[PDB]
Structure formats: C-alpha cells, structure tokens
Design a protein around this ligand. Structure first.
Ligand SMILES: Cc1cc2nc3c(=O)[nH]c(=O)nc-3n(C[C@H](O)[C@H](O)[C@H](O)COP(=O)(O)OP(=O)(O)OC[C@H]3O[C@@H](n4cnc5c(N)ncnc54)[C@H](O)[C@@H]3O)c2cc1C
Ligand SMILES: Cc1cc2nc3c(=O)[nH]c(=O)nc-3n(C[C@H](O)[C@H](O)[C@H](O)COP(=O)(O)OP(=O)(O)OC[C@H]3O[C@@H](n4cnc5c(N)ncnc54)[C@H](O)[C@@H]3O)c2cc1C
Ligand SMILES: COC(=O)[C@@H]1C[C@H](O)CN1C(=O)c1ccco1
Ligand SMILES: COC(=O)[C@@H]1C[C@H](O)CN1C(=O)c1ccco1
Ligand SMILES: COC(=O)[C@@H]1C[C@H](O)CN1C(=O)c1ccco1
Ligand SMILES: COC(=O)[C@@H]1C[C@H](O)CN1C(=O)c1ccco1
Lengths: 588, 588
C-alpha cells in the first residue's frame, strides 16, 4: 500500500519535495525554492511512521534512497547538488514550468466548492485556472464572483433574516425599559438591499484579490468540457478558444426551477432575483414549501409584508415532520398565510412592473386544491421556490464519458472521481451528497490536497448538521424520528423531549411552550443518539457543537454526565428525561 | 460488591419495592401502593444484569428469594399476600409512616442545590423538610424562596444583560432599514427592575407550589445543626424548636464580602442590593474584577451609566488571561473606565440616599495605586464585588464534628459525604467544586437518588463549561492555555486560533477583528483538546454542545472531520488551522 500511495502521489503532484526536518541539505533546497518563488508540497519523512519504507520506495523513481528528492509532474528532478546546479545556471524556472498541458488544474465554476479547491491547489504549486460565468435570470439579473451562497443564497438570506429578527428586538426593548414605540417604526426595503449588496460587493472583490494573490488565473468565461483534457471557453465577447489541463474539477452548481405553466417565466421571480430587487415585493405569494420558500416567506412577513405560501403536499419534505409542522405553526401564528394542498395553473399579468416609480406590478394567480376546488387571488409579486437543478448538458459534451444519474447529477466515487479518471466533481452537482456550502468547501479543499500534496483524508458526508433560518429557527443533526423508526423498529427507539422558554422571552411576554427539542435514541446500542432536533432562537449556534459529539458516537449517557451552562437555551439538552412512550407532557 | 450495594440500598431507602416487570403479583402491589398514595422507589430485577445475584442476596434480609419484596426504612415488610393483608386491615399507612425521626431528609438551605435535592428525594417516598431563611443585607434587602441564582444572581443579571444588549440592537436596526433614531431613545431603570422582579416573583411562587405538590414541608426558618440528627430551627417570631432527620443535606450557599475599610458597610452596596434597587445607581464605581464585577459594570454602561471598575491586580483571576484581557479591552473601548493596580482606603458620605425623590446619594472614594500614588473621586453608587464566603459557624455547631477547610468550606468525599456519616453537603459550600448553579442541581439530584432509590452514579466535576456574560460574552470549557503549558510543557502544547466577524456585524458596521476563538491541544495525546475558548455573541449557546465532545475526549481530528453549519459563528471551530507557533496572523 505504501508503494501504491507513493506512485499516485508522485504522478499527480505538480511540484513536491521529499525531506526531513533535521536535514541541512533539505533546508538548503527549501531556501532556494522559496527565494525563486517556486511553490511546492513537502513531505517530511521523519514525521511519518511509514517513512523508512517510503524512503526505500523513492528509489523506484529516482534510483536513490536519500533526502532531499524533488519531483515535477511525475519526473525526478534531482538531489541537493543537482537542484542548485539548475538554479546557478538559471535553468530551474524552465524545468518547473515544463508541462504537457496549459494548467495542472482547471476548475469549471467559481462558487463555494470551486474557489476553495482552486486556492488550495495553487498553494502546493499547481498552475490553476478558475472559470466563472453567471447566466442571467429571465428578467436580466446577474452578479459577481462567488457562487450561489455568496450572491443569492446563505449570505443575503441570513442578513434579511436578521433584519426581520430586529423587528422583535424593537418590540422587546419596551418591556426591558427602553423608551421607543414600536408601532410608529417602519421598514425601508431599498435601504436594506443597498446595505446587503454592499457587503456582497466586498465579497466579490475579496475573491478576485485572493485568486490574484495565489497566482490563480481567473477567467470570466463559460466553460465546456469537450474531451478529458480540453476545455472550450467562451468569453464576454463571444470569442471561443480551448485550454488544456491535467486534472479537471466540475463545480458548476444549480439554478432555480420554474413550473411548466403559462405566465411563470414571464411574470414570476425566484430567489435569484429577490436579493437585489429594487422595489419591495408588496403582497406576495410564495409557491413552494422547501427551506428556501419558508425562509423567504418568513422574513418578508417580519418586514411588514402580506405573505401567502402555497403548499402542494407537505412542508420541508425530507426533514422530521413533527419539527416541520411546529416550524409552520409558528409562522402561521405570526402572520404568514398558507394555502394547503394547492398548486398553480397559470399567472396572468394585470400591471407591468413600474421601473421608474420603483413599484411592483400586479398579477392574478389561478390554481386548484387536490379535491378539485378552485384558487383565484391577486398578488403584486409571485416567487417560485419549487426546487433547483443542474444543466450539465451545457457544461459537458456527452462524448467525454462522464456518467450522470436520472436527475442529471454526476455519479462519483467516494474520492469525488467521475467515470473519467482525471475528472472530478464537487458541491451540489455530486449525486447523493448534502447540498450545503460547508460540504462543498471541505470536499474541494480535501480533494486538492489529495491531488497535489499526497494527502489521503476523504470527506465524511454522514450526519452533517443543518439549520433552517425561519422566524423561529430549526437546527438538526442526524436522523429524523420517522427515519429512525423505519430503520430499526419502534420498539428499539426511545425519544427524550421537552418544551422550553428562553429567559429573554420572559420579561418580553413571549410564548411559554413553542420552543421544543428532542433526542432520538437507539435502545439496543447503549442509547446511541441517532438524531438531535431543536426549534428556538440561535438554533444554528446551539446545534453546531453537538455535531462533534454525534460524529464521535455520543449516547444519552454522554449528554447526562455533561453539565449545563446557565442561563442558556442549549443547556436543556443536558437534563432531558421525559420519554414519548411515557405519555408524560413535555410542557414547562 | 453486590451484597455491599444491597445492604446500603436497603438501609437508607425510605420505601422501596423489589420487582420484575413481568410479574402480575408485583403489578398488584404497585396498584395498591399507588391507590393508597404511597410513594416509593422501585428496582426491576429483570432489567439488571446483576439481578439473579441480587434476588439471592435479598434473602439475607427477608429469608425469601422471590419478588415482590417491600421494605420500609431498612425493615422487610412483606411479599404480595402480606402487603395486601396490611392494606385490607387498614394497617399499611401506619407501617410506612413508622420512623425513628421526624423526617427521612432535612435540607438546610432552599437554593439551587437544596430545592433540587429535596424534590428528587420526595419522589421516592422520603419524608422531606426544606428550610430556607434569607438574612437581610446591611441596608435591609431581602427576597423569597429560590437561592442566590433565582433572586440575586444568574436570573436577574442575565435579564439586565439582555436589556443592555438591546441598546446595540436598536443601533443596528437603522443599518438594516428600520426608521428609528437611536440617539433619541433613553432607558428607564425602574421600569426594567419592575419587569425583572415580576419574573422573580413568579419563580418564588413556582417553587412553593412545587414543594407543596411533592408533599415537601417548607419551613421559612433559620436552621442550625446541633447534633448529627438534630436541627434547631428559629422562625420569623424568634420561636426556637428542634426537629430530627435521618439524613441531613447542608446547602446554605454563600454571601458577598466587604473590605475592612471605613464606610464600606455603611455607604456601599453589593450585588444582593443591585437587582432590586429602586433608583438608577448613576455614576458608579465597581470595586473588584471577578465575573460578577465585570458583568454588572458592563450592563450598567450599556444602560447609559458612567461606570468605573477598580482593579487590584488582574481581571478574572483563574480564567485564561489572554481571554480576560480581550474581554476588558472590549469593555474599555465601549465606555467602561478602569483604575488599574488600585485599592480603596475609605468611603465618605457626602449625600444620604433620597428615598422619597428616588435618587442615590453621593460618596467620596479615597484609595491608592500600588506605586503609592493617590486615588480620589466622587461617585453616586459604590458596588463591592470582592468575593463571596460561607458563614457555617452560624449553621453548624462545632461539636457535631463536620470538618471544614481553611476557607470555611465543607470537606467532602466524592459522594458528597462529610466527616459525619449521615450528613452531606452540596453546592457552593462543598470545598473544591466549581461554584455554579447546574453543578449544584446535578449534585443534589444524583445524591437524592443514591440515598433513596439505590442509584450509584456520581457527579462528575471535571471540565465543566462556563460563560461570562460581559457585553461581549466569553465561553470556556477545560484548561486555560497557561495551565495546560504548566502541566505538560510548552513543547507538548499546540494552540489553533482565529479571529472572526459575525455576519450580523457586517451591515451594522461593527468591528472586524475583536471576536476570537482558540483550541488548546496536547501533541503527545493525539492532539487532544485540553481547552476551548470563545469571545463573541451568544458564547454560552456556542460553547455548550462542545462540552459533550470534550467530556468524550475530542481531538483536533474530531473537530476537523465534523462539518460546519453556515452561516454561524460556531462553525469557525470546525476549520481552525493557524497555530500560535507558526507566527501567522489570526486576523480575518
Ligand atoms: C436561497 C438559498 C439559500 C441557501 N442557504 C444556505 C445556507 O444557509 N447554508 C448552506 O450551507 N447552504 C445554503 N444554500 C446552498 C448553497 O448555496 C449551495 O450548496 C452552494 O452554493 C453550492 O456550491 P457549489 O460550489 O456546488 O456551486 P455554486 O455556489 O452554485 O457555484 C457554481 C458557479 O459556477 C457557475 N457556472 C455554472 N455553469 C458554468 C459554466 N459552464 N462555466 C463557468 N461557470 C459556470 C455558476 O454561475 C456559479 O457561479 C442556499 C441556497 C439557496 C439557493
Ligand atoms: C451575581 C451572581 C451571578 C451569578 N451568575 C451565575 C450564572 O450566570 N451561572 C451560574 O451557573 N451560576 C451563577 N452564579 C452562581 C450561583 O448563583 C450559585 O452557584 C448557586 O446559587 C449556588 O447554589 P447553592 O444551592 O449552593 O446556594 P444558594 O443558591 O446560595 O442557596 C442557599 C440558600 O440557603 C439559605 N440559607 C443560608 N443559611 C441558612 C440557614 N442557616 N438556614 C436556612 N437557610 C439558610 C440562603 O439564604 C439561600 O437562600 C452567580 C452568582 C452571583 C452572586
Ligand atoms: C410538514 O407540515 C405538515 O406536515 C403540515 C400538515 C400538512 O399535511 C402539511 N402541513 C402544512 O401544510 C402546514 C402549514 C403550517 C403548518 O403546517
Ligand atoms: C442532513 O443535511 C442534508 O443536507 C441532508 C443530507 C441528505 O443527503 C439529504 N439532505 C438534504 O436534502 C438537505 C438539507 C438541506 C439541503 O439539503
Ligand atoms: C486580566 O487582565 C489583564 O491581565 C489586564 C492587564 C493587567 O495586568 C490587568 N488587566 C487589566 O487591568 C485590564 C483592564 C482592561 C483590560 O485589561
Ligand atoms: C470551570 O468552571 C469553574 O467553575 C471552575 C472549576 C474550578 O473549581 C475553578 N472554577 C471557578 O473558580 C469558577 C468559574 C466560575 C465560577 O467559579
């Protein structure tokens, strides 16, 4: 296995030095490389229990067994005397830039995964290009470098969530002694958007600076893989050319779907458009029931909007459904209207958007309930959140040989390799993986280290924690209660649960028994915690630390022996005792 | 060991039933006991791997080996036929109330620990009395049932902390688009206090109801242990009497100290007085540098006060000192003044408190710096936070034989037993233990279960997490960096660290590099996490979940393989990489 690792490491590393921390000759080569601004990976054999065997195996490539040994793109370059010879004769720079391809790495897609992968690879001396292009929305919206999260996802949506949370802070401040009168305060949508977009602009610029400072080539051009090593690019002037690369990472993400009904594309919008919208949406219908749909409906209501959500079947399909219903009940008691068991049939235009007075238009929405009854109502804005999909037929010629699944996503091995050996895929287009920004970043960083620095660590996709930033937030890690019961049987599942009330809500006169948490446990495995669920303020901060314990195999007993921090919401996890089987009430 | 456990369980349980879940005779005895309102512990032998051996050992007390077997205060009462005989002849109630003492348990002290212990014991049939008396402060302040945390500690202090946090929420709301003008809003101290005190009143009442519903005798009287089983009580009319109890739990807590200088007791106040103060303190000097001192100074500043803290040597002695300095720097940049290396010599009265106009008085404070230079300044309120101490000479006759340490706290074994075999001590008076409310509650609950239900689990006092609720909060679990280095040597310690900026602070234009976190790790033990530290918003919610992982022995690798939740502050722990040895900057 050592010999098989060494061959794979030597073949794919761009520039790599085998060394020992105690060798003055290695130190001498390091200095020359640093002085010449030659970036490289380094493996210190004296810090690996496998080092003696590795030192012996190197002779299979170089015919020597000593350190240092420097390699460039699979070719042994020399020991100390030889590297310094190339330096002194001004031959070293041409040797380390010698390649069959233009780039060691081409990343198609400049988002969460692709930027992480490209920056990490360049750190070990891989000559890297990152391609990013943003196809405009139907109404023309576009944005800068960074991907979906930075521009039209996690970042603007949580900032708008905070704007909505501040409405309750203003209400609570009177009870805590502050002299303001909440009923005389209003919200200005365009002032919010200007502040959100200025932060996003600082992120766009930060990414371009980071790529420049890592010597990464940034091309604002649409990429198409036409053979295993050839990428056809089209720039902003429609000029077409081809570049070559040794390794390819596909990281192109997804975009919103529209339903196939009249008026949807013409007159509706999606989350792509919402976060830079120049006018307040007004009376708004959200079609869909995903976390995107409920998060946007939630902050629109808190900012004073008249908001309706149209639900085809259930809320948050794929999440614990007891928690999903508690999430929606809270929203429905705090202003959000729901049209349940309902789908749309067409959108008709009554008024065109007023681009000069900065005002929305007006629409008539016609639909029907599952029993056949009719839906008909007017709205100023209609937002579709009915899922997201990739469009890899635009990215990937089918003759290259990259296998896709029934949904159009890329079938990968557990090290992100596609069915073409030099081509990898990360992020939302990787079939079967959780579609989250921290997953894409970890996958891209770890992959770059395996390709160019001889690392072995894989990304672990199991028990990845999540948080839904609805007006009352919902954090989770592990299995839903119904999934656990399906897998192991009701008799082997124990559920501990409790309501709770944040101390902050007492003087503010908020609700007694709305926040809720539970632990879903396996009796026959020492009461292993299979899933953790919490509905309450700051739910993502609450949940995150427990993700480490669950990764380590925490049991109910581990939660019991750990002491709480008081006063907090999170401490309620350390003293749970009421079981669902007992029938005892969970109320405070 | 089984035989030794069984004897200890039988001797101390008040009412206990040995049973099996599948026995209809046991079910029949259970029903009779439930119908007669006889509370008891129950041990189901079929759910213990030790059950066959226990069944054999019971015959050493009862001369029978079958189930059910019912015991009262160490005496075997009968099997099925015999218990039903006593029931039918109306003899059972007198048998189960037969005792050498008035009470199975007397708890001296009605606070966090004592209330928890008393309620848990009563659940297993122990006849329990809880004694609570609140000696008034020098100026006359007193309060109701619940102890220091409920009335003059964690609960009011965090509610006042929230009042102060809402001042920055009001400032931030303008940047997020809300139409308020922060500079025209003021705070009303007395309106805040009225709301805080109404919540506290609901807790006082909740505890009296809970004791009544658990059949616990509540005596509002001062207790004194005069022999191992005799408690002398003095009531509100100065009437003196004696009650007896089998087991005794001491849970009397501590009170604030005053420095031995002229004017301190006469003219200053402490945290005991602050949380119900009828007037705003005005220009305020806080003498001390504990977490109590900095927490009170912090919210007083955020509520508009002119506040000075006088520091004898260092801030937060006993906590990580890099974190302590970051905590104080933030307070000093946000309005709190510090007089460093300074102690007071006297307090002189210039104006008496105006009880009718609802106004503070005025004082002249004279002190000196450690180099000899003089301090002299006028303040309206002077608050001493220079530590807390017990006064067990008032609680405990020295002839009883309970050993105290040099600081006046009770020397206990690892099951909370004192040097007198039937007397135990929990909470802040237990020598050497962390002085926190969740520790006192766990100790009291677990102890009651060992005494009266045959449990074996001990309280684990190691690696208990904490949070200091200063204006920017500080959470910690495990060793400080300097303690880790002292124990293991600098060469064996690695520290990963990073600054961070909450997403909420970006649009609000708050500081870039003030929030900070670090992990203190042991190289020679697989990079075990010895301590975790975080300075930022919601630090107690952040820290709590990680306490479970640290209890389980988490390593740096466990933090690395766990994926973050985005966008959160807590996720920064999952991607730490900059080491202190590297010298690389931790800034964003
Ligand atoms: C509204 C919303 C809210 C979300 N909130 C969260 C949240 O709170 N937390 C969380 O963890 N995740 C959240 N997500 C998910 C997160 O945004 C994604 O998981 C993440 O952005 C996926 O990263 P990626 O690298 O796979 O792709 P992306 O970030 O989508 O980047 C792909 C990039 O490649 C570009 N591209 C596409 N085709 C080509 C081509 N042919 N040539 C060149 N460039 C191309 C795209 O235009 C895009 O810029 C949210 C998503 C949405 C829609
Ligand atoms: C300002 C402040 C803030 C704090 N904040 C926190 C925080 O955020 N988190 C945290 O975990 N901890 C906090 N603490 C600590 C916490 O309050 C204590 O650890 C906890 O209250 C100790 O519980 P106890 O049962 O040991 O005693 P106590 O809660 O002090 O209860 C003892 C009771 O017994 C009574 N008593 C005394 N003598 C007698 C007698 N002879 N007869 C009858 N009754 C008697 C006392 O009057 C009192 O009512 C704080 C403390 C202070 C002072
Ligand atoms: C997951 O949610 C549900 O399952 C509930 C019951 C129903 O079947 C679907 N549903 C809702 O539409 C809803 C709206 C507000 C609260 O719940
Ligand atoms: C547990 O975290 C996940 O992301 C899970 C993992 C699994 O693959 C299905 N899944 C999701 O559908 C999801 C949640 C939010 C966006 O997608
Ligand atoms: C623990 O704190 C310290 O150690 C610093 C340095 C000094 O020795 C003590 N000290 C402070 O008084 C202080 C005030 C505001 C920030 O720090
Ligand atoms: C780690 O948590 C603790 O409480 C530690 C444990 C240790 O006994 C010393 N100690 C304290 O002095 C302390 C902190 C807050 C109040 O007291």
């Amino acid at each position: 296995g050592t010999s098989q690792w060494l061959r794979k490491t030597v073949d794919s590393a761009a520039v790599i030095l085998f060394s020992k921390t105690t060798c003055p000759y290695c130190k001498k080569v390091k200095d020359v490389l640093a002085e010449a601004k030659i970036k490289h990976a380094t493996i210190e054999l004296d810090q690996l229990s496998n080092g003696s065997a590795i030192q012996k195996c190197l002779a299979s490539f170089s015919k020597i067994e000593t350190v240092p040994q420097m390699f460039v793109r699979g070719k042994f370059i020399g020991d100390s005397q030889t590297v310094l010879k190339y330096y002194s004769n001004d031959e070293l720079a041409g040797i380390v830039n010698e390649s069959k391809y233009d780039y060691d790495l081409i990343v198609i897609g400049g988002g969460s995964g692709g930027l992480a992968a490209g920056k990490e690879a360049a750190k070990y001396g891989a000559k890297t290009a990152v391609l990013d292009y943003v196809e405009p929305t139907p109404i023309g919206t576009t944005w800068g470098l960074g991907g979906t999260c930075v521009n039209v996802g996690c970042i603007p949506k949580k900032l708008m969530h905070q704007a909505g949370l501040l409405s309750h802070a203003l209400e609570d401040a009177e009870h805590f002694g502050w002299s303001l009168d909440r009923s005389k305060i209003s919200h200005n949508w365009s002032t919010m958007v200007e502040g959100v977009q200025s932060h996003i602009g600082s992120l766009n610029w930060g990414y371009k600076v980071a790529l420049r400072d890592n010597q990464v080539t940034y091309l604002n051009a649409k990429g198409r893989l036409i053979s295993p090593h050839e990428v056809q690019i089209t720039d902003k002037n429609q000029k077409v050319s081809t570049i070559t690369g040794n390794k390819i990472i596909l990281a192109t993400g997804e975009r919103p779907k529209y339903p196939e009904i009249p008026g949807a594309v013409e007159y509706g919008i999606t989350s792509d458009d919402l976060f830079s919208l120049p006018y307040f949406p007004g009376k708004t219908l959200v079609i869909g029931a995903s976390y995107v749909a409920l998060e946007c409906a939630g902050f629109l209501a808190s900012l004073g909007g008249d908001v309706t959500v149209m639900v085809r079947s259930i809320l948050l399909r794929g999440f614990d459904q007891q928690m999903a219903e508690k999430v929606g009940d809270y929203m429905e008691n705090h202003g959000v209207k729901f049209a349940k068991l309902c789908v749309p049939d067409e959108i008709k235009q009554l008024k065109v958007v007023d681009t000069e007075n900065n005002k929305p238009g007006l629409l008539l929405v016609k639909g029907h309930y599952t029993d056949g009854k009719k839906f008909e109502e007017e709205f100023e804005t209609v937002i579709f959140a009915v899922g997201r999909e990739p469009q890899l037929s635009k990215v990937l010629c089918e003759t290259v040989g990259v296998k896709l699944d029934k949904n159009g996503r890329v079938v990968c091995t557990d090290d992100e390799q596609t069915t073409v050996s030099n081509v990898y895929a990360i992020g939302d287009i990787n079939a079967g993986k959780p579609q989250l920004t921290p997953v894409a970043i970890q996958a891209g960083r770890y992959l770059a280290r395996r390709l160019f620095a001889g690392a072995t660590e894989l990304t672990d996709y199991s028990n990845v924690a999540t948080t839904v930033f609805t007006p009352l937030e919902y954090g989770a890690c592990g299995l839903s209660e119904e999934d656990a019961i399906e897998k192991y049987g009701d008799k082997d599942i124990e559920v501990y649960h409790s309501n709770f009330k944040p101390l902050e809500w007492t003087v503010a006169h908020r609700e007694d028994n709305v926040c809720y948490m539970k632990l879903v446990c396996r009796k026959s495995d020492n009461m292993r915690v299979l899933g953790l669920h919490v509905l309450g303020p700051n739910a993502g901060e609450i949940t995150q630390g427990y993700a480490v314990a669950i990764k380590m195999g925490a049991t109910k007993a581990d939660f019991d022996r750990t002491i709480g921090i008081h006063p907090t919401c999170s401490e309620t996890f350390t003293t749970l005792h009421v079981t669902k089987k007992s029938g005892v009430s969970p109320i405070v």
